[PDB]
Design a protein around this ligand. Sequence first.
Ligand code: A1IZ7
Length: 285
Amino acid sequence: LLRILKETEFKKIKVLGSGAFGTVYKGLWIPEGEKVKIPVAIKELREATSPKANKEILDEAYVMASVDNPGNPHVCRLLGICLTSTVQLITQLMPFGCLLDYVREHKDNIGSQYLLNWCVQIAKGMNYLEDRRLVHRDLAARNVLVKTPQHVKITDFGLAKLLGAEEKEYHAEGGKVPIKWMALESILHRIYTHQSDVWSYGVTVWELMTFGSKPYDGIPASEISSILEKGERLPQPPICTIDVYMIMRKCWMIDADSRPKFRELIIEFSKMARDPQRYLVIQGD
Ligand SMILES: *CCC(=O)N1Cc2nc(-c3cccc(Oc4nc(F)ccc4Cl)c3)n(-c3ccncn3)c2C1
């Protein structure tokens, strides 16, 4: 289920990028028994980030590897972990990086069929995590990876728990917390449910419809909860019809249980992806 990797089994070759939580490398992996070289992506988390001993990290890592049973094509697979002074997470290499950078770099080449189909895949992946009783806590366009332009997957599930974000004693997260993707009950009371994930899903969808725009750009994070209380929400993207915008607007409801379910989101966006130009107005479609 969970492969514990020796530093001798894998080699980091090139740097793909450096986020806030660590650095991801393009690497090569030759399993213990095997005599083959699997091309992987290695995420080396920032040292001394987790408030858990190596046994509790491995327990979390096993629960992250367990999501691949029975699995979902739109959720990433944790192939293995390597515990050194840092936590190293290993997964299959996705050549296109994340959907945030993808939609920004391919802004003038993305049609309504692709955007709507990505909304279905992300909702299919999130619905599977809901089935597995797992709350992601950090769904964003940066955490949706591109295997191929027509195959997206959700990464970094169970990472917030791993980094000690589900503790009453450890909350040493200053400016790292994703306030502009969090539901009001999460900003105010640190309550994280599948319905708070729907809120973040609506923001993720808005990021795609705006071709990688920053949500609440310029507004300080300290003021977001007050903006939400006044009834302010992310603007309607220029390509969106009111049918598409109402789905996003509903993910951003104050009553968590009234928000659309991932099951319902798969159906609505699937209906929309059958006549894409009716729901998204993009130049050159
Ligand atoms: C916009 C940011 C970006 O381009 N990327 C974020 C990112 N993370 C990962 C990644 C690589 C290895 C392990 C990994 O963590 C997990 N993988 C699982 F399967 C399950 C749970 C976790 Cl915590 C995340 N990559 C990446 C790059 C290239 N190929 C694959 N993944 C990116 C890209």
